[PDB]
RNA sequence: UUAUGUAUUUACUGACCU
């Protein structure tokens, strides 16, 4: 995310599979992380949709509800038009708290 | 154009 | 200020072809690609022409077409790679007329890059997957299956990532139900880039590699890898599985090459070039075309080098191996970029400059008598096989589909004397190249001639049944003479023919079966094979007005109006209604129409009216004589016509001034008159049938045909004279047409070419235009010729005469000095054959005045042998009186890459005396390439290349008199407005410079701050430069209001001039516009900057009126960049922002597809835009109607 | 008088977080 600068995402080839967000992420963008303006669904590699992970959260890792989305300041930055953007590791939050 | 609110009646006249 | 585009005569040169079954049927269709534009064509295979049928803007750079079939499949489906990160898979749904787009897979980001896909795009022969691929480091497979719907489905895309890899070509590889295989030209260039010797990238040969696809293991692995020993530029499918010997042909420089891996030894066959074809001092040979064909016997291919050589290559193979490849000369055409041969036997050439062209194949195979040699024969000493070129023995030209790329330079200019001004082109690369030039009206062509003497009226087309073509007779009269003549050869006065009645005669049908009625003085004739005749028409007195004829049922007046029917009997004879009207007088016209259909009465009468009123009446029985809907006119209609024309009645009147198009439909009548207008004298509206259909022939001061063509109602007028009437024709002599004459004389037209907007013609040119200028006084061009790698033909001459020598000098003691006669006085066309081509640094070059009327070379001048044009004004100068002269710049050994000139000089011409001919005057020199002349307060200027030089004359050389050097990087044009200069840098921009009077000074005074590579310009007013660049965009600088020009002559403001110039607007149209020229396209209209591209597209900008005008196109886009996105997946205001953000203009090419969506998001539209779809349509072509065509 | 290194509060940022 934007908040969190030490999150990388995944990045590679974006595949046909439909990103989902979690319920408590529901209408987030991906990117610039924002609720207004959703433009062009998400697609995300294969790697990142294998068995147990499919119709998981993009962001969160939670169960998905609804499908993900680009703002369209993501869109017409073309920042759609990179990898996938399936947020790999789970850093520094929600894991401290959760020791907490 | 028309009385009432000057629309364009285009020729079209009709019954 | 608030600009809005609008192409007139949409692009026409054809970068990618490619062929199939793309309606599902039977037939073939090729899919052609004019860059920014997606057509669909048909080759009419009976006929042999070549129907456009569907023309859509993608509003991408199509950087790659193929179409391919699906397995066990029936229709092929387009793929198409373009400029967005996006394949797009699209099928041509035949029903809605449209291409479904099927789906649309995002990869990369956008624009030309180098790194994302979509440059190369090869596909499966079978239909399984597809590559996309980049010209550096990365490619993608789509496995493409089909699921239980029949419906097309596809992948994730696979990777085949490579880093730092060039790929030059890449194509499917036939593999008969086995893992797909994809061959590609590659090439490895880091220790090319690693090592300073610069030897490493010497000895960097190419790859032939395949990428085999484990469809079992879901990825992509380099199965194959080999090296090359020259580098290949393109390959060819070989096809296989059952068919053939599946591999690759590989096309290089001088030599064609079978491959195929495992265990074909590698097979070369040295390309044949000419018998002793003089463009030859070092250059290679490669091909250009590939054109496969499966003959279901055999395959072979039509493979073509870049002089247009087209060459029948056929392996034959003994074992299942290849054993050998050969080939021969098949035949030769114009240079194509692609080929489409297709079953049914066409042959299908796109040329890339110039006209397209398709080809009846007469004798394919050609295995017969020519001297075809082959790969595996013990040949030495170079190529070996040469052959001599021919004129055509296996094709026949059958269509010339027109194209006016490249358009290099254009006027408009009313050099003609007609009304409406006409466009002056520039066309062609090298010896195909034209003048061409263009008006608004029709091919009206004229097969026969009669000299009709008197003054005749009118004249009507009638026959013997409805069932013939032939049209028995046609009468003529204009007040006592019916002159019925017969139709066919020696067409000559008539006596009483077995139709004719009397000798005042004023209208013929046919009514019945053979049954005609003809109406006269004393009206009423009934003619099939007796004259049975009752002529009554007697209510007293009155017997002559206003015939008004259906082909089942008669409505007829005389003084006074709503009267007589004089119908007939189905059975027999003519009868009639006693139900009168009489309807105090007030008749002008009448017009009815008739259905195809109809036991009863089954039509609908109009009447127009002395009064400002017209008239509608139905006259079925029940409810007859009875008004229906009512009218409004201004002044009188004079011509009045019914009609239908899609595959709603569309009331056509006329005013004796302007025109209209209701559209009645026939229980209810909401009319919804769209208008038009035409001197102006009364307009006279006549149905006449072309193409298969009908339309109305409205005449006035021109002529106006009004014909709806896919529903469009073009109405688009005629390129002849006034002609005072006319009535349509049919013969043997010629099809369908139209006799038309009230004048004197008497002519049978033909309207041939019917879809487009323009009509062409050409006057042929030696070499490549580079731009005109126009004498005013007793109009004639003045042209500059000039061609890179060109012998001027005082070489050409000496060029074949030392040849001649050398083949009468080797050897000839044994002979034949009849080779070299022989070759000297067989000359073959330049135009046909291609120009031979002058090594490099050479430059062809003439100048030439020319009628614009006739077309014929009123003078010509060529240059020295690389001494080449680039630069012409004609002018009168100050010092001097009244005569003209004629500037050209001229420069000498260029060389063009890398940039070496040896300076240049200046022609200075006298023309004398009208202007025919062209006197020498004298010669200056100048050190660099005077690319731009213009005349300016009795002087030139003349822009040297970095340095602005006025000019005056002297009678040994010109003499300047002011001279900057503060000016960029290179000069490449100069306009003026009068005391101010625009210099056009090659590479900055415009840059404004003052002249004094007083001093003599050229003092810069703005600048602009973008770079933008300007290739031409035009002024707009006193402040504005409206400008175009190489890349595509249209920019329009307009000075701030302030920058006072009183700068008298160290820092400037940003290393250049100090008051920078501003932008007010920029623009994307995806091609080179080489020409902006402010003018009025029709008189009656208003101003509009006119631009010609480069690929042969002619568009417009218009300003907006008002403001609501503005917002409300500007909300119809904003509406339609939704609902309707581009077809490649480009995003529309992301092309046309493509290199500088878009300003105030309104792209209307996305704003004339509103007319092309079904009408629920019409509906969506409109109403969002709380409009109706026909209001919109309305609104939407009035911009069109008023600015332009 | 710009300035460092640190012990060190106080303020402030990211629609950060059960
Ligand atoms: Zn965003
Ligand atoms: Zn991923
Ligand atoms: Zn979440």
Redesign the interface.
Known sequence: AKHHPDLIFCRKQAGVAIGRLCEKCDGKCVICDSYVRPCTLVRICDECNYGSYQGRCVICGGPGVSDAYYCKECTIQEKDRDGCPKIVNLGSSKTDLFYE | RCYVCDQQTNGVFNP | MFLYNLTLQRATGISFAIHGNFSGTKQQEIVVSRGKILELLRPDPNTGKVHTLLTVEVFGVIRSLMAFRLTGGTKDYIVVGSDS?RIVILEYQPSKNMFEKIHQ??????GCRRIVPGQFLAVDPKGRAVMISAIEKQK?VYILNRDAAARLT????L?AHKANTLVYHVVGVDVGFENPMFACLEMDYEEADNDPTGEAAANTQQTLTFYELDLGLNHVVRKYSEPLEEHGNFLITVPGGSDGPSGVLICSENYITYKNFGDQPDIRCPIPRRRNDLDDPERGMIFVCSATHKTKSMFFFLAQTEQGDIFKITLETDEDMVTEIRLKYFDTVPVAAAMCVLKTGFLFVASEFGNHYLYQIAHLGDDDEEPEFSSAMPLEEGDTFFFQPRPLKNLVLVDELDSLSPILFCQIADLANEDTPQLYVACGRGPRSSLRVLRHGLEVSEMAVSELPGNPNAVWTVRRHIEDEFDAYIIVSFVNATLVLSIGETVEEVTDSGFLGTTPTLSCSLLGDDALVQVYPDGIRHIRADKRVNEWKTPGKKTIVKCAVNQRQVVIALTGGELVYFEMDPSGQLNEYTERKEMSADVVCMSLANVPPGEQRSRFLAVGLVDNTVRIISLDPSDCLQPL?????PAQPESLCIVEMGGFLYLNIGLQNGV?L?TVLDPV?????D?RTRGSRPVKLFRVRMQGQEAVLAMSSRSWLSYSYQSRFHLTPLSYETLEFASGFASEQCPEGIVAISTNTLRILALEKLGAVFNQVAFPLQYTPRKFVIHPESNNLIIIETDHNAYTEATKAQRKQQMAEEMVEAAGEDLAAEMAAAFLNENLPESIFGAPKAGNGQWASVIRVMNPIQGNTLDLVQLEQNEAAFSVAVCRFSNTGEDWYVLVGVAKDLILNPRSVAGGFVYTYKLVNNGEKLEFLHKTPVEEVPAAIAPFQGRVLIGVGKLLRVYDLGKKKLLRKCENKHIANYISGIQTIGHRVIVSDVQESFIWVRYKRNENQLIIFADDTYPRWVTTASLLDYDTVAGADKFGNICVVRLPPNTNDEVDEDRGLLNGASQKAEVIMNYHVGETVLSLQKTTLIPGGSESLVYTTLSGGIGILVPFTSHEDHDFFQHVEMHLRSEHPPLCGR?H??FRSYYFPVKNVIDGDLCEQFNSMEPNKQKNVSEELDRTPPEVSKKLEDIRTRYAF
């Open positions: 990160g897979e995002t990869f990369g980001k956008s993608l596809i992948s994730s895309p990777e809907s009512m009218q409004a006119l209209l209701r009548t909401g009319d919804l008159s208008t995003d205001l992301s």
